[PDB]
Amino acid sequence: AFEENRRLRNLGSVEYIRSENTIRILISSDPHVGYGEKDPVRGNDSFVSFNEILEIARERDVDMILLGGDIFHDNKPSRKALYQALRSLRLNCLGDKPCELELLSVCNINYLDPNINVAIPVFSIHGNHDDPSGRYSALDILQVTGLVNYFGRVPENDNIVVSPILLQKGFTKLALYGISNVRDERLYHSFRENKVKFLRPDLYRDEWFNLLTVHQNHSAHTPTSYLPESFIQDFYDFVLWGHEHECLIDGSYNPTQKFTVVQPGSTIATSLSPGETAPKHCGILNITGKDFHLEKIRLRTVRPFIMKDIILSEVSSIPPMVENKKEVLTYLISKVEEAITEANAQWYEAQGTVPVVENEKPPLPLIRLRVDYTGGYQTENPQRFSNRFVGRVANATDVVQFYLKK
Amino acid sequence: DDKAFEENRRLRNLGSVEYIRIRKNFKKFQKSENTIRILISSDPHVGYGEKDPVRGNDSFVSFNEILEIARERDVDMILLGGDIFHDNKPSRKALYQALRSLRLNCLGDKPCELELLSDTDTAVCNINYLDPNINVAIPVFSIHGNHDDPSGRYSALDILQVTGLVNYFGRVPENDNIVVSPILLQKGFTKLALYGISNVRDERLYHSFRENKVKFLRPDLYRDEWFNLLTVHQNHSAHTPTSYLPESFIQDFYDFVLWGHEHECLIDGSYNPTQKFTVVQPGSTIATSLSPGETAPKHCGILNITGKDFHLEKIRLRTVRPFIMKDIILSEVSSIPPMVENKKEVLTYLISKVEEAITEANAQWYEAQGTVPVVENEKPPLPLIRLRVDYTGGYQTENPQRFSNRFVGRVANATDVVQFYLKK
Ligand SMILES: [Mn+2]
Ligand SMILES: [Mn+2]
Fold this sequence. Notes:
The structure is a homodimer.
Chain A: H1 2-7, E1 13-17, E2 23-28, H2 45-59, E3 64-67, H3 79-93, E4 102-103, E5 122-124, H4 138-144, E6 149-150, E7 160-162, E8 165-169, E9 172-178, H5 184-192, E10 196-201, E11 208-215, E12 238-242, E13 248-254, E14 259-263, E15 281-288, E16 291-298, E17 305-311, H6 325-351, E18 366-372, H7 382-386, E19 400-403
Parallel strand pairs in A: 1-10, 2-3, 3-5, 5-6, 7-10, 9-11, 11-12, 12-14, 17-18, 18-19
Antiparallel strand pairs in A: 2-15, 4-8, 8-9, 13-14, 15-16
Helix pairs in contact in A: 2-3
The structure holds manganese (II) ion (2 copies).
């Protein structure tokens, strides 16, 4: 069943119906505005980092912003989360700057409104949400204000029609496609049953730089609970991959399909997973005809997160196998202290500063120790160990996790 | 209580009043010249009765109507007495619908003839039309109202302000020390000093006036040249002598008082001869309960200000579902044989009163539309009908639901058409 997935290529059907020349796009995904709102330390993280993304777009003078979904963490965001998102979009996206993008294709393009002066149009697809969910989303609200362009709507999970937004700047032509989040198993089934219809403009067939935006699992435990890369039509040149939190901004080239996949990652860690450790970035994609150049930009406002894997039997400072309750503590405490120094150094690197009295100090970092304690060693209560770093770490819970080798 | 309500009328001009140092196009968007025209309304309660199969879209249609009349009649601004939303946390549909109506009816190329003299973060534009990136044709001004929904520092009104669609004024950070500062607006020779007090728990506000903890600020320039307008959202009357705002408490320098919160349409206004102001209670644009006060046909108004004078034009709302109520005292009826098995007689009379109320409701609707009942014309929506029946004196009743079910597809409230009670 996993073997079958590699063999299946170009699924669904393709129908044909009706830097002045460099398209600059700020690419990001998953800001999860509102996540960890009630946390005393982490409460304002999502608001600050979502603002940063829009701030970089304005400072760097990009033509547009493209997001891979999950602007909000919840289906029903709090009044604070909604207010903060709207405030950031209004202050960073409105202005006298002319929009050099020409459209060739309340609901109509925002930067096309005569009553709204949009300097940098935001384009986003709908993402996945785990809180309890009518026919009105928080993304529909962002669209109605004229601040975000909601594209890639999936009204029916059965028959999905993928139509493009056609944009031109000088000689460079962009055919922007999107598929809003669909339950992975459902989407997988739609591609297998040939229920996904891609629409291409008849004119300038080979002229349009084809960009697809998705919000799905890139991998899964079950062979039907993710979207295989081979399923995606080979006429595409670039794929922006949302939903997946790990920053893989450098990208991966698929040699068969002939298209690059860029998984930018979230702008906030939503769990203490290994995937969340990779420093967060956004990117500037510079399209110029057929080729492009992607510039990775490190996020300055994201709280550092260091994870360390420890094997006790390998620690020459600890004696085995006795009551080393004291040995394990001293050693483990020093590893947290080492992880904090690594986190602080990672933060100053992102800022371009040095640790001195005149400079701003780093925020409390997220620290996780995965400790193998086999044959044998004395362990602590994980919560009791985590209480030791009360004003040194952002995570009051889960500083340590003890495990035995399987 | 009686002695305390009496003392309320004896007291006047509560608090403290001091002075503070301060077509035409005043909008900054970049891509009756002496008469300030204001569309006045209150309490649209967007989202109320959302889940009702018949009444679900009433609040959205009527809130749109108010903004639609403002645009059609070419007013300078919209002034609301609070409660744009029914809930503290409105649904996604309610918020979407309010924003859609505001964007379509208030944005446009129409020049704003109102000059902002002084507005006594902010990273955002406090005043709407002064934003160079938003083309505001008709600025909306509103105060915060009361909500019975659980309040889980950010309001839905703050969200409307942040989009640049509504100007939230008359904020009340502290209940103890309330400072009432004006928004100063000029059109030709006409000078408007606009004041607001967002809803405060009635008992708490009453105490603030008594403890002289309410400070009113007046512009030194043009002292007796401003037309003073106050916007409130409080109970105009109450059972307890401390649970409402007495008119006498409000400073007499005011010329006009827009009274929000109260749902009954009393758009004609009342003149207070001592305080020398006119109080206008416009009423809600939707019935929130089947109360006697909700029966009076709904209106909005156009307040025309020239110098220190005003003319108010009453406008009937066409989209509001008709509501007829009848109070029936069974002992005051005949021929109803009392203290006998009179179920048939009681029912026969009550059915005829519902039929009478339906005919009255339909006639009230056609009147609001300016049409006659003919095949080419639109038919009225299902009306709200309520019978409050006193059955004291020996009278047989019927289950309210079974009685209401006799009029299926004839009334909007198919569950509670009748209410049987005994006089206390
Ligand atoms: Mn996600
Ligand atoms: Mn009310």
